């Protein structure tokens, strides 16, 4: 449509739609003229009966439905943090996605499929000191796809790099 | 006039002080209110009798002298491209350096010391497809000191990523 497009920002495991990093990314989308939404996956994450990271299939299906709806109105950018990145990437494989912004993406997901993504612009922010997702794993995944990769001196939460991550997202949106 | 501080920008092999990438860094410095200078090392680079990359020891000494002069006004920012990055890093160990910005830094330099730098804020932009300086080499160097590292889909000359590199430099300067 008239609008340059819509950003769907997916929070990490046991986080929620008002968490710091997705809220920061929503402010970037706002300031850059994109519409945006932060879906709530907290119910799904609480479903331990379906796995140690909850109902991940449910997360994937919920995001797929939301993205599909959005693509029937105009371009869609998917972004996330950690588990949110994993599902954004997987969903890009199922809906036409303009670009993908991934904070601390896990490359492995137990018995679920390994991280993959559509062959569209990908920008990643990862922590050198991530205790959960070794930096080498994200470096290898990004290298295979020549995805833009920003490594910062932080751990998995990226708690000291919310502005750096916001700027990387802005740079991605400004390129589209 | 008033300034935020001073930057010394060191050009790559043979490219000179008007070269595309150090010119872009000078643009950023100027826009953000920093003073800047771009020394000419082309006479030293022309000394093929002394090395495939010319007289790199002479290059080091010339930058050292320039940086000593600039630090009469306080800690200086040192930035470079390619061969200029290698000398900026090495000089940082010998003068008070506020920050180091390195594009496609050589990690080895034949009989000269391996790449090293002072314990200052460091921001690196490297190319995934750098045929001269494998990305793995720069990743290992940056990891060891938690240097901020941006990896882009390009080769050594960064012909398609001058804007991304410029933005990374701006981000470094704005953080000081
Ligand atoms: Cl939102
Ligand atoms: Cl950093
Ligand atoms: Cl240059
Ligand atoms: Cl030679
Ligand atoms: Cl890139
Ligand atoms: Cl500034």
Automatic annotation (TrEMBL), chains A, B:
Matches recorded under SUPFAM superfamilies: alpha/beta-Hydrolases (SSF53474)
InterPro entries, A to Z: AB_hydrolase_fold
Superkingdom of origin: Bacteria
Protein name, as recorded: Alpha/beta hydrolase
């Amino acid at each position: 449509g008239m609008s340059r497009g819509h950003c769907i920002l997916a929070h990490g495991f046991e986080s929620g739609p008002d968490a710091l990093k997705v809220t920061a990314l929503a402010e970037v989308a706002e300031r850059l003229g994109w519409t945006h939404e932060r879906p709530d996956f907290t119910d799904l994450d609480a479903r331990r009966d379906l796995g140690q990271l909850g109902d991940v299939r449910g997360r994937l299906q919920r995001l797929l439905e939301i993205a599909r709806a959005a693509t029937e109105k105009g371009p869609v950018v998917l972004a996330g943090s950690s588990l949110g990145s994993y599902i954004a990437a997987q969903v890009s494989l199922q809906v036409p996605t303009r670009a993908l912004f991934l904070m601390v993406p896990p490359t492995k997901m137990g018995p679920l499929p390994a991280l993959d993504a559509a062959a569209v612009p990908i920008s990643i922010v990862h922590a050198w000191h991530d205790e959960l997702i070794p930096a080498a794993d994200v470096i290898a995944w990004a290298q295979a796809r020549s995805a833009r990769l920003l490594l910062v001196d932080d751990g998995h939460r990226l708690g000291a790099h919310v502005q750096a991550a916001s700027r990387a997202f802005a740079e991605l949106l400004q390129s589209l």
